[PDB]
Design an enzyme around this catalytic site. Structure first.
Site, PDB file in Angstrom:
ATOM      1  N   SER A 181      -3.099  -5.662   2.132  1.00  0.00           N
ATOM      2  CA  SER A 181      -3.773  -6.551   1.210  1.00  0.00           C
ATOM      3  C   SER A 181      -2.757  -7.496   0.590  1.00  0.00           C
ATOM      4  O   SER A 181      -1.558  -7.213   0.545  1.00  0.00           O
ATOM      5  CB  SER A 181      -4.496  -5.768   0.109  1.00  0.00           C
ATOM      6  OG  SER A 181      -4.737  -6.587  -1.021  1.00  0.00           O
ATOM      7  N   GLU A 239      -1.433 -13.768  22.868  1.00  0.00           N
ATOM      8  CA  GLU A 239      -2.072 -15.060  23.071  1.00  0.00           C
ATOM      9  C   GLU A 239      -2.576 -15.658  21.765  1.00  0.00           C
ATOM     10  O   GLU A 239      -2.718 -16.884  21.671  1.00  0.00           O
ATOM     11  CB  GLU A 239      -3.185 -14.886  24.124  1.00  0.00           C
ATOM     12  CG  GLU A 239      -4.169 -16.031  24.408  1.00  0.00           C
ATOM     13  CD  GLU A 239      -5.244 -16.249  23.355  1.00  0.00           C
ATOM     14  OE1 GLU A 239      -5.419 -15.414  22.446  1.00  0.00           O
ATOM     15  OE2 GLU A 239      -5.908 -17.291  23.430  1.00  0.00           O
ATOM     16  N   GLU A 269       1.648   5.935  -3.292  1.00  0.00           N
ATOM     17  CA  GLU A 269       0.948   7.000  -3.989  1.00  0.00           C
ATOM     18  C   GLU A 269       0.490   8.067  -2.999  1.00  0.00           C
ATOM     19  O   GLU A 269       0.218   7.765  -1.831  1.00  0.00           O
ATOM     20  CB  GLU A 269      -0.254   6.441  -4.747  1.00  0.00           C
ATOM     21  CG  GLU A 269      -1.273   5.729  -3.876  1.00  0.00           C
ATOM     22  CD  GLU A 269      -2.462   5.228  -4.666  1.00  0.00           C
ATOM     23  OE1 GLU A 269      -3.393   6.024  -4.906  1.00  0.00           O
ATOM     24  OE2 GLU A 269      -2.469   4.036  -5.039  1.00  0.00           O
ATOM     25  N   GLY A 282       1.466  -4.365  -5.168  1.00  0.00           N
ATOM     26  CA  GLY A 282       2.253  -3.203  -4.810  1.00  0.00           C
ATOM     27  C   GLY A 282       2.675  -3.081  -3.363  1.00  0.00           C
ATOM     28  O   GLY A 282       3.398  -3.935  -2.840  1.00  0.00           O
ATOM     29  N   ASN A 318     -14.753  -1.890   5.083  1.00  0.00           N
ATOM     30  CA  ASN A 318     -13.785  -1.476   6.085  1.00  0.00           C
ATOM     31  C   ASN A 318     -14.443  -1.215   7.430  1.00  0.00           C
ATOM     32  O   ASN A 318     -13.789  -1.359   8.465  1.00  0.00           O
ATOM     33  CB  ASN A 318     -13.036  -0.239   5.600  1.00  0.00           C
ATOM     34  CG  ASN A 318     -12.298  -0.484   4.308  1.00  0.00           C
ATOM     35  OD1 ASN A 318     -12.128  -1.626   3.885  1.00  0.00           O
ATOM     36  ND2 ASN A 318     -11.876   0.588   3.659  1.00  0.00           N
ATOM     37  N   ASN A 372     -12.910  -9.955   0.251  1.00  0.00           N
ATOM     38  CA  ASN A 372     -13.963  -9.003  -0.078  1.00  0.00           C
ATOM     39  C   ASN A 372     -15.258  -9.645  -0.558  1.00  0.00           C
ATOM     40  O   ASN A 372     -16.334  -9.121  -0.256  1.00  0.00           O
ATOM     41  CB  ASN A 372     -13.475  -8.025  -1.153  1.00  0.00           C
ATOM     42  CG  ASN A 372     -12.743  -6.836  -0.568  1.00  0.00           C
ATOM     43  OD1 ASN A 372     -12.644  -6.691   0.648  1.00  0.00           O
ATOM     44  ND2 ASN A 372     -12.225  -5.977  -1.435  1.00  0.00           N
ATOM     45  N   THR A 386      -9.234  -7.741  -8.511  1.00  0.00           N
ATOM     46  CA  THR A 386      -9.082  -6.487  -9.242  1.00  0.00           C
ATOM     47  C   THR A 386      -7.861  -6.506 -10.157  1.00  0.00           C
ATOM     48  O   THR A 386      -7.982  -6.280 -11.362  1.00  0.00           O
ATOM     49  CB  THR A 386      -8.997  -5.313  -8.261  1.00  0.00           C
ATOM     50  OG1 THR A 386      -7.769  -5.388  -7.528  1.00  0.00           O
ATOM     51  CG2 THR A 386     -10.167  -5.349  -7.291  1.00  0.00           C
ATOM     52  N   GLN A 391      -3.219   1.289  -0.016  1.00  0.00           N
ATOM     53  CA  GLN A 391      -4.502   1.985  -0.076  1.00  0.00           C
ATOM     54  C   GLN A 391      -5.561   1.269   0.750  1.00  0.00           C
ATOM     55  O   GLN A 391      -6.339   1.912   1.467  1.00  0.00           O
ATOM     56  CB  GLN A 391      -4.965   2.112  -1.526  1.00  0.00           C
ATOM     57  CG  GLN A 391      -6.255   2.889  -1.690  1.00  0.00           C
ATOM     58  CD  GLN A 391      -6.731   2.927  -3.123  1.00  0.00           C
ATOM     59  OE1 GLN A 391      -6.244   2.181  -3.969  1.00  0.00           O
ATOM     60  NE2 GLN A 391      -7.690   3.800  -3.404  1.00  0.00           N
TER      61      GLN A 391
HETATM   62  N1  LIG Z   1     -11.762  -4.416   2.072  1.00  0.00           N
HETATM   63  C1  LIG Z   1     -11.159  -3.475   1.354  1.00  0.00           C
HETATM   64  N2  LIG Z   1     -10.238  -3.829   0.390  1.00  0.00           N
HETATM   65  C2  LIG Z   1      -9.620  -2.875  -0.345  1.00  0.00           C
HETATM   66  C3  LIG Z   1      -9.905  -1.536  -0.136  1.00  0.00           C
HETATM   67  N3  LIG Z   1      -9.158  -0.811  -0.994  1.00  0.00           N
HETATM   68  C4  LIG Z   1      -8.408  -1.656  -1.734  1.00  0.00           C
HETATM   69  N4  LIG Z   1      -8.691  -2.939  -1.350  1.00  0.00           N
HETATM   70  C5  LIG Z   1      -8.080  -4.164  -1.892  1.00  0.00           C
HETATM   71  O1  LIG Z   1      -6.833  -3.834  -2.467  1.00  0.00           O
HETATM   72  C6  LIG Z   1      -6.658  -4.464  -3.715  1.00  0.00           C
HETATM   73  C7  LIG Z   1      -5.964  -3.501  -4.669  1.00  0.00           C
HETATM   74  O2  LIG Z   1      -4.596  -3.378  -4.353  1.00  0.00           O
HETATM   75  P1  LIG Z   1      -4.082  -2.336  -3.241  1.00  0.00           P
HETATM   76  O3  LIG Z   1      -3.973  -2.990  -1.886  1.00  0.00           O
HETATM   77  O4  LIG Z   1      -5.017  -1.154  -3.193  1.00  0.00           O
HETATM   78  O5  LIG Z   1      -2.648  -1.860  -3.791  1.00  0.00           O
HETATM   79  P2  LIG Z   1      -1.729  -0.892  -2.898  1.00  0.00           P
HETATM   80  O6  LIG Z   1      -1.481  -1.526  -1.554  1.00  0.00           O
HETATM   81  O7  LIG Z   1      -2.381   0.460  -2.763  1.00  0.00           O
HETATM   82  O8  LIG Z   1      -0.346  -0.757  -3.704  1.00  0.00           O
HETATM   83  P3  LIG Z   1      -0.340  -0.343  -5.258  1.00  0.00           P
HETATM   84  O9  LIG Z   1      -0.590  -1.565  -6.101  1.00  0.00           O
HETATM   85  O10 LIG Z   1       0.999   0.245  -5.625  1.00  0.00           O
HETATM   86  O11 LIG Z   1      -1.432   0.669  -5.495  1.00  0.00           O
HETATM   87  C8  LIG Z   1      -8.044  -4.827  -4.212  1.00  0.00           C
HETATM   88  O12 LIG Z   1      -8.050  -6.140  -4.722  1.00  0.00           O
HETATM   89  C9  LIG Z   1      -8.944  -4.744  -2.999  1.00  0.00           C
HETATM   90  O13 LIG Z   1      -9.389  -6.031  -2.644  1.00  0.00           O
HETATM   91  C10 LIG Z   1     -10.831  -1.174   0.831  1.00  0.00           C
HETATM   92  O14 LIG Z   1     -11.090   0.012   1.022  1.00  0.00           O
HETATM   93  N5  LIG Z   1     -11.457  -2.149   1.575  1.00  0.00           N
HETATM   94 MG   LIG Z   2      -1.994   2.170  -4.114  1.00  0.00          MG
END
Ligand SMILES: Nc1nc2c(ncn2[C@@H]2O[C@H](COP(=O)(O)OP(=O)(O)OP(=O)(O)O)[C@@H](O)[C@H]2O)c(=O)[nH]1
Ligand SMILES: [Mg+2]
Ligand SMILES: Nc1nc2c(ncn2[C@@H]2O[C@H](COP(=O)(O)OP(=O)(O)OP(=O)(O)O)[C@@H](O)[C@H]2O)c(=O)[nH]1
Ligand SMILES: Nc1nc2c(ncn2[C@@H]2O[C@H](COP(=O)(O)OP(=O)(O)O)[C@@H](O)[C@H]2O)c(=O)[nH]1
Ligand SMILES: [Mg+2]
Lengths: 437, 50, 54, 107, 431, 51, 53, 54, 175, 51, 437
Positions: free
Chosen positions: A140, A254, A71, A144, A228, A206, A179, A11
């Site tokens: 991230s 590089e 998802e 997941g 973002n 973040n 989170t 996500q």
């Molecule tokens: N900078 C930034 N970080 C985000 C954003 N959305 C989610 N995150 C980071 O993503 C973390 C949540 O886990 P996700 O990366 O969303 O999990 P996922 O990759 O979707 O996989 P799942 O756990 O199955 O949902 C949070 O701690 C946020 O720091 C975003 O729009 N911008």
């Molecule tokens: Mg997700």
């Protein structure tokens, strides 16, 4: 010719990719339909977009991106809205069940369900590419898909593509704000498997950008769109030299050579300057030395690891705009004479400069003020050993009682992987300790 | 029956002449030359199987 | 350059024809989804019950 | 099954030049010479005759699916520099385990 | 297209589920006939999570209503939003339960379970992704406790990879309303802890206290109770039906909230809940929603958060808001009342944000808490159970319907050592 | 009375949409005029001695 | 019982006839449109086929 | 082809105006048939209903 | 081939990290003897013992209606695999049509610890570690023949589960 | 009075990892199909009596 | 004088030819009544239809086909359909009573009452055409008319016409999808008498066509009409070299000589690329490199098998449309340098290309799109050994206890023929393994 493939997994990756491809379309003059506003000749006619957008026989720009999530909510939100005709529908891969903040679910379960299709889309895009420069993988270190599927995908990419560049843009868990709960577990297990199958990983959290938006931008309650957008500005400043002519060009092959001193030490930070609003930029005379000092200031860093606590190894300074190399040289000289910035003793040549003439573009209705010059500051420092130590302490606290281990084991990963991953990052932690002297 | 429109096979539905091939909703919007007919009432069976 | 322009115009003609065919095919798919492949029973299916006292 | 060179044009027909970023497969360049009257060493069926040095590889080729890859991958370091002696040792260990599991899955 | 099969057992479970489908039909703009009458397409994308397509634009809920008393079946059919349900998934018996767990489990309650499982199997393989099963009932009667636990055991034996969340109305001793409710609760907590992997225990005294202080509510009755329960029922699955900045579904909440398998009894809550007299004195801000989540009197499980340590806290927000404000509030609560938090889990909060608020409000919030203060209701049930098991009271009914005292001893021992496991994980050093 | 009021709002909406389509069609036609003008260079074949 | 059905058939025909009269108003307006008419311009989509056609 | 193109679709629009009038007139006559039938049925409803007190 | 005597009990006893290192190889065999008698005595009264672990012992009632309030019943005791264990280890279970007109009782640690000179904390480990050892044997791909002496033997050969019931059980449980 | 902290961590150490699902997706939308029956996994070439 | 006699046996063959002659008459501009329009749309005489259509004295274009079936209503609905004036009346030959999924009934009892009449009609068509090039037999392996009568027909054709080419299009039964129980019996009985009386039989699987229509054309619920449109496009791409103009063109005698190495291994696989619909065809590259990469793909084969689990022998590639030889050459080179394709050891040169000029013709009511490029790839790989072994296993499950054998015993056939068919297909299994060795 200087093609790049952007794989946005999770996500966070998909939302960052939305904010990135918006800026790329604004840079290259692409509507959210894939077409030039004018004809083939006027208002365009160049081929500068081929690093990101391929061209069909009619003149439709389609991006070189692969959007992956398990998802369907965020990917369907991309499919239905604004850039609904820009992104390729076969390059918008989504699944039924999410990984639900679980590295092993993303690595052996549903993450392994989709990796054949994802690699098929990636190899189709690479066959389109005619001089591919590398893979920018946005994810991230949370839970997941961003950990498990990203690590599995990068393992498969290292298996089949050889030693091609695999630059990560990784959202690191902040020291205080986080989170998920199983986030230290996922981060340990994904850094263990992405230590070897990686070239470089730009580490962008973040909380530091939250503090930056509070202090320098006066938003006082920003959101993921602002975060973002700043990450998109970072990646645009990194990739700018492949699209715009400059005095000093820097390609993607590089960054590994000039930011990785030793194997498994491939986690540099990121900083954008001058990140500031219009009512504050009215009172400033923003110049090369000022924005270089802002980059080296331990408050504009976009990861909460102050460089006072460690030593720099490598320093990539990407100047972008109407910047002059004489003032670049003077600013870097006065940074080297400055004492608060500390460089490691075995690296006298710690700087790498890339100057591009393109001024920083601004998103309409955006947060950043328009400036004539900007720096992407990209440092490999030992101050990240503090963050690794804190995250290992969190893992040890969670793992002493072994909470949240039954999920991982009962859906498929051996428990010895936890121990070997903690051993791997203990070895990394001692590696940073030995590099620092 | 006539009213349910269930006496159309797949071959008769899809293998239509190519001059009228891109039809709309399984009909021919241009080939229609019988309008305004009054003689003929639909009975209970016709109105029940519609 | 004229050959390249002719190639691009032929591509654009193909895009226009494929767009018309695409809207026709989407209309046909929506027709086959929301109609044909549905079975709501009419009154004649229930009329054939309780029509004989024996 | 015969990518037998192009002499002046070996600079072209390379996988890097024809948009194949994957690692390429090595055929036998620079054809050799024979004497004449090669043995038929077969029949009108597709058999290999008796006494022929038959290969020990799989008749269906060597390819592994996703659900039979190793759970761990070494990472193709190919460098063996600035690492400790146990690091060199266990990198050899994972490389040997990788090669053994691919050989067992192919065979 | 992950989607949830809803099951509802007993009079209490049937009335809660009827209120739940009323609430989540308002959230999607569905009239009781079954048509979609909403305005935006956001209410129409993930309509398959709870509703199944019929002919035309009709949406039949994926719900199974089960009871041994036909009067409640007539009541929920002829009540508000009774037309939405399918008459085929109204399987019932014409005997009754008699507030007897033995009669609901080992007798004619097990006569009906064949047709019950046939209906649930029809709904389950009428799926394509099948996120999980969501059950509502009460541990105070026969069909709610006994039949509900029988469905729990059979469905877990059938599909042991799906998220099974049950809510269950636990009995409060100062509400009474039944004399054999400690027997019914003890004989069912054993099946709940062993089979179900997500449980959101709800208490009638906590509901009454919320109605009488946070909402004034001169005569709340059973409507407002099921209304608040339906609020927390929708607020835990809102991210499956609507997109958001930070999505989190039932499996993600179960992963981030349940540390050990038999550690899964939660403390739901909702915000905002504002009285009519204090409506104009309140401004909806994210810190205000965070405080009303982390207020003791706002809890819906009769526990006191100060009377124990939280293990994990899921915080699901709804509406347009700031991720920084959410993160600083949910970090500030941990920094402030750190004594009511286990120190062997850093970041005791899972945070989810959905940017689609309910119809009406611009912002809303949902609390789920795996607190160690959940043991006090189990201790109250166990002490009432041993009080009326000391003299072997009311056991002739259960022995007539075919149980021995050894099952009661197993129930007591399992509840006792589950509470002891709570105490041991609660009183644990950091490392 | 509400039906006759709702019929007025339909014509007012389509009357106001017609005024937008007046302006939007003028922008497309002005775009094409500036489209041929921007493409004119010294080696343009379009070009002409004219008054 | 029959009067309610006869009323209902009147209500169906009257709603149909109300549609026919002002659909003719639309088609007569399109028929009387000419080249020199001032309410004539380029359209954004024009050639679309609406759903329910 | 452009001058004849406008004339071809002007007759097509004029054909549809006559096409609606073939159905607008028949629907108008049935409304007069229904209205006369309603008036006849209400009188015959009243005739039998006035015979109730008879 | 792997029996239950002297390998699974020894592994569960030593078992590197164990809850119950004090009880002896005779004691873990005797407590499963008690489990077998428990399953026998509850299945005798038309009930079914369910153990979270291996699976559930039920019947397959074959009831043909004779007429005039008579019926012939063919009774067959069956062991249905627990689907959690089946999905965990991928064993091909034999699906059996089991009706809901069979009361199902869980494994009674109070009963197994009453007549035993042991306690609940030991009798719970005596089955948990044995299920864990059987799962380890399934990982090891060794031919498991785990006995239920007095009832029958559960055989796991190669991705298949089948239980051979003893003749005396099959002739006194048939009704 | 057993120590649940120790007697949960013991089987957290040494509980069984399950075999991952041998299946695949190809529709860019999900639609999981089993891979062992399908047509892609070669098993009948192995068999026991192929020749 | 490039005429081709198209025989269509069974219900599957009749429906495939029904979709096929539609596309032929649309390509050649022949009206459904059989009358070519009097000028104003065509140029001059234009006798390119002579390969498939002959010229009567009335100017009607009767096709060079024969629709033979042992059933009414399936050829009769064609006789009462929209092409009722296009076909000669006894060109479409019907039986009275089904073989009914029975190889014995279609080969020994009902087939030898209509085989003489269909041979007489084939003799009339062969005497009419003066440049008879080959037969195209369209049938299914499901059984009945499609297996027994097809085997009898090919047995009589082998002795009547001798060395004349006989291509087949065989609807092979799917691995898991089956509309009949006795399909293994029918398929293995017909694939014991086909081998010594055939030249080359292209192999088409209904489940694979279902998957192609589901994942490419975006029809989630395809239909036999869509299937037969795809096989119609395959055979049109095969026979376009005879009717149209090209750079290097492919005779029908090419398809035996350049594709089958051994006399009893004559089962190649069709593949069409692109197979994309018009909604997504505006939004891709339609390049010859990408359509070659798509035809060399396990996800786009017309049969449900994985070619990566076996070795190729030959590939007959019909490039149709705006293709150029050097881009074809570079596509073949990068396929040869790919990993996942492994050719067999004894076959150095494993390609045979044919470049045509006429683009594919799209039906206005079909599901495909108007494209300028297409590839019909005919691959002779060893991945069909898995399919034959699966058929042998499904045969041995039934024949171990003489299931369904009394029908075949009583309806003419003796008991031993099952044993000889099983031994022959076991020898075929051994051949398929030892070729891959
Ligand atoms: N900078 C930034 N970080 C985000 C954003 N959305 C989610 N995150 C980071 O993503 C973390 C949540 O886990 P996700 O990366 O969303 O999990 P996922 O990759 O979707 O996989 P799942 O756990 O199955 O949902 C949070 O701690 C946020 O720091 C975003 O729009 N911008
Ligand atoms: Mg997700
Ligand atoms: N591709 C395709 N296959 C078809 C079609 N119609 C039938 N089949 C195949 O035909 C098989 C069944 O055999 P049929 O062709 O129907 O029977 P037959 O050849 O007429 O011989 P009889 O059974 O005696 O009638 C099925 O397994 C289908 O796969 C079709 O329209 N397209
Ligand atoms: N919160 C709430 N509790 C209820 C409701 N209806 C019944 N109860 C409680 O449920 C208990 C009795 O359970 P019961 O309905 O008889 O279970 P059943 O026998 O299975 O139908 C009583 O103590 C009530 O307090 C309701 O609508 N809401
Ligand atoms: Mg047939």
């Amino acid at each position: 010719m200087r093609e790049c493939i952007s794989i946005h997994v999770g996500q966070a990756g998909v939302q960052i990719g939305n904010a990135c491809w918006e800026l790329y379309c604004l840079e290259h003059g692409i509507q959210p339909d894939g077409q030039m506003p004018s004809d083939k000749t006027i208002g365009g006619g160049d081929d500068s977009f081929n690093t990101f957008f391929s061209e069909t026989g009619a003149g439709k720009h389609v991006p070189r991106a692969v959007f992956v999530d398990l998802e369907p909510t965020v990917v369907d939100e991309v499919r239905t809205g604004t850039y609904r005709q820009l992104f390729h529908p076969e390059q918008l891969i989504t699944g039924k069940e999410d990984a639900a903040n679980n590295y092993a679910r993303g690595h052996y379960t549903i993450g392994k369900e989709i990796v054949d299709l994802v690699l098929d889309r990636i190899r189709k895009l690479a066959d389109q590419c005619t001089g591919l420069q590398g893979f920018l993988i946005f994810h991230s270190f949370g839970g997941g898909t961003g950990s498990g599927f990203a690590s599995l995908l990068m393992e498969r990419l290292s298996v089949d593509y050889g030693k091609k560049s695999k630059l990560e843009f990784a959202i690191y868990p902040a020291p205080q704000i986080s989170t998920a709960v199983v986030e230290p577990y996922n981060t340990i297990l994904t850094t263990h498997t992405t230590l070897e199958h990686s070239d470089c990983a730009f580490m962008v959290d973040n909380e530091a950008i939250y503090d930056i938006c509070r202090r320098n931008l006066d938003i006082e309650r920003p959101t993921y769109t602002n975060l973002n957008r700043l990450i998109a500005q970072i990646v645009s400043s990194i990739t700018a030299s492949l699209r715009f002519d400059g005095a000093l060009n820097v390609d993607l092959t590089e960054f590994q050579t000039n930011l990785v001193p030793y194997p498994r030490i491939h986690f540099p930070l990121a900083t954008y300057a001058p990140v500031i609003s219009a009512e504050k930029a009215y009172h400033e005379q923003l110049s090369v030395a000022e924005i270089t000092n802002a980059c080296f200031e331990p408050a504009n860093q976009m990861v909460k690891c102050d460089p006072r606590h460690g030593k720099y190894m490598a320093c990539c300074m990407l100047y972008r705009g109407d910047v002059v190399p004489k003032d670049v040289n003077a600013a870097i000289a006065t940074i080297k004479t400055k004492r608060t910035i500390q460089f490691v003793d075995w690296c006298p040549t710690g700087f790498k400069v890339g100057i591009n003439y393109q001024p920083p573009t601004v998103v309409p209705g955006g947060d950043l003020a328009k400036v004539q010059r900007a720096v992407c500051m990209l440092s490999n420092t030992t101050a990240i050993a503090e963050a690794w130590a804190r995250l290992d302490h969190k893992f040890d606290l969670m793992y002493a009682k072994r909470a949240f281990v039954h999920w991982y084991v009962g859906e498929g990963m051996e428990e010895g992987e936890f121990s070997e991953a903690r051993e791997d990052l203990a070895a990394l932690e001692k590696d940073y300790e030995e590099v620092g002297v | 029956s006539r009213s349910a429109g269930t006496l159309q096979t797949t071959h008769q539905a899809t293998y239509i002449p190519p001059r009228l091939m891109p039809g709309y909703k399984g009909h021919c919007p241009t080939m229609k030359f019988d309008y305004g007919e009054t003689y003929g009432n639909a009975t209970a069976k016709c109105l029940q199987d519609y | 350059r004229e050959q390249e322009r002719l190639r691009k115009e032929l591509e654009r003609q193909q895009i226009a024809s494929n767009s018309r065919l695409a809207e026709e095919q989407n209309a046909h798919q929506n027709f086959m989804d929301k109609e044909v492949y549905t079975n709501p029973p009419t009154a004649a299916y229930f009329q054939q019950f309780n029509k004989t006292s024996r | 099954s015969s990518h037998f060179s192009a002499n002046q044009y070996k600079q072209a027909f390379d996988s890097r030049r024809l948009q194949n970023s994957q690692i390429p497969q090595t055929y036998k360049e620079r054809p050799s010479s024979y004497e004449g009257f090669t043995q038929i060493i077969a029949n009108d069926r597709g058999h290999l005759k008796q006494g022929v040095p038959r290969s020990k590889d799989s008749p269906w080729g060597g390819f592994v699916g996703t659900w039979e890859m190793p759970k761990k991958i070494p990472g193709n370091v190919t460098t063996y520099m600035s690492r400790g002696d146990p690091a060199i040792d266990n990198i050899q260990k994972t490389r040997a385990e990788h090669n053994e599991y691919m050989r067992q899955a192919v065979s | 297209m992950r989607e949830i099969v809803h099951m509802q057992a007993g009079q209490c479970g049937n009335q809660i589920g009827a209120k739940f489908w009323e609430v989540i039909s308002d959230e999607h703009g569905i009239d009781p006939t079954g048509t979609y009458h909403g305005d935006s397409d956001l209410q129409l994308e993930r309509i398959n999570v709870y509703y199944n397509e019929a002919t035309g634009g009709k949406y039949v809920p994926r719900a199974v209503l089960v009871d041994l008393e036909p009067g409640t079946m007539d009541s929920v059919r002829s009540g508000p939003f009774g037309q939405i349900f399918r008459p085929d998934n109204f399987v019932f018996g014409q005997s009754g339960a008699g507030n007897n767990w033995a009669k609901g489990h080992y007798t004619e309650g097990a006569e009906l379970v064949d047709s019950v499982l046939d209906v649930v199997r029809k709904e389950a393989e009428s799926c394509d992704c099948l996120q999980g099963f969501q059950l509502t009932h009460s541990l105070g009667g026969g069909t709610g406790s006994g039949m509900g636990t029988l469905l729990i055991s059979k469905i877990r034996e059938e599909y042991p990879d799906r998220i099974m969340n049950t809510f269950s109305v636990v009995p409060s001793p100062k509400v009474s309303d039944t004399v054999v409710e400690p027997y019914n609760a003890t004989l069912s907590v054993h099946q709940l802890v062993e089979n179900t992997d997500e449980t959101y225990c709800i208490d009638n005294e906590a509901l009454y206290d919320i109605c009488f202080r946070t909402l004034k509510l001169t005569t709340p009755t059973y409507g407002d109770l099921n209304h608040l329960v339906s609020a927390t029922m929708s607020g835990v699955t809102t991210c499956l039906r609507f997109p958001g900045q930070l999505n989190a579904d039932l499996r993600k909440l179960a992963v981030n909230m349940v540390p050990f398998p038999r550690l899964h009894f939660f403390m739901p809550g909702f915000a905002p809940l504002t009285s009519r007299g204090s409506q104009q004195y309140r401004a909806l801000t994210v810190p205000e929603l965070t405080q009303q989540m982390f207020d003791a009197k706002n809890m819906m499980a009769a526990c006191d958060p100060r009377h124990g340590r939280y293990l994990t806290v899921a915080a699901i927000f709804r509406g347009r808001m700031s991720m920084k404000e959410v993160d600083e509030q949910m970090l500030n609560v941990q920094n402030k009342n750190s004594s009511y938090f286990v120190e062997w889990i850093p970041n005791n909060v899972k945070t989810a944000v959905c940017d689609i608020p309910p119809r009406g409000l611009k912002m809303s919030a949902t609390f789920i808490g795996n607190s160690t203060a959940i043991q006090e209701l189990f201790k109250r049930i166990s002490e009432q159970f041993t009080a009326m098991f000391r003299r072997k009271a009311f056991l002739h009914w259960y022995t007539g319907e075919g149980m021995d005292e050894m099952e009661f001893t197993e129930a007591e021992s399992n509840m006792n050592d589950l509470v002891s496991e709570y105490q041991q994980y609660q009183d644990a050093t950091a490392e | 009375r509400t039906l006759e009021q709702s019929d007025r709002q339909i014509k007012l909406n389509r009357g106001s949409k017609h005024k937008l389509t007046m302006d939007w069609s003028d922008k497309l036609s002005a775009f094409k005029i500036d489209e041929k003008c921007t493409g004119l260079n010294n080696n343009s074949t379009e070009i002409q001695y004219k008054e | 019982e029959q009067l309610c059905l006869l009323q209902e058939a009147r209500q169906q025909l009257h709603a149909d006839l109300r549609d026919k009269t002002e659909a003719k108003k639309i088609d007569t307006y399109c028929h009387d449109l000419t080249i020199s008419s001032p309410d004539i311009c380029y359209q954004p989509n024009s050639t679309r086929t609406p759903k329910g056609s | 082809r452009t001058s004849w193109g406008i004339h071809d679709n002007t007759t097509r629009l004029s054909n549809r105006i006559d096409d609606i009038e073939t159905w607008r007139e028949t629907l108008e006559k049935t409304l007069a048939d229904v209205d006369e039938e309603i008036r006849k049925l209400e009188e015959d409803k009243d005739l039998a209903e006035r015979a109730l007190e008879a | 081939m792997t029996e239950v005597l002297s390998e699974l009990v020894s592994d569960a006893k030593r078992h590197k990290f164990s809850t119950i290192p004090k009880l002896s190889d005779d004691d873990i065999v005797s407590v499963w003897e008690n489990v077998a008698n428990f399953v026998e005595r509850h299945m005798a009264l038309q009930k079914g013992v369910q153990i979270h672990g291996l699976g559930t012992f039920t019947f397959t009632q074959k009831k043909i209606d004779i007429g005039n309030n008579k019926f012939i019943l063919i009774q067959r005791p069956v062991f249905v695999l627990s689907e959690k264990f089946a999905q965990t280890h991928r064993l091909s279970y034999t699906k059996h049509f089991t009706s809901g007109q069979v009361p199902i009782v869980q494994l009674n640690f109070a009963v197994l610890s009453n007549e035993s000179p042991f306690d609940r904390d030991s009798v719970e480990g005596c089955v948990r570690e044995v299920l864990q050892a059987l799962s380890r044997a399934v990982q090891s791909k060794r031919n498991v023949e785990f006995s239920f002496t007095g009832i029958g033997r559960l055989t796991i050969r190669d991705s298949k589960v089948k239980m051979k019931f003893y003749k005396d059980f099959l002739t006194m449980m048939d009704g | 009075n057993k120590n649940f902290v120790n007697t949960n961590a013991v089987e957290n150490i040494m509980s069984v990892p399950k075999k991952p699902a041998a299946n695949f997706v190809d529709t860019v939308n999900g639609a999981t199909h089993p891979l062992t029956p399908s047509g892609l996994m070669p098993k009948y070439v192995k068999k026991k009596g192929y020749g």
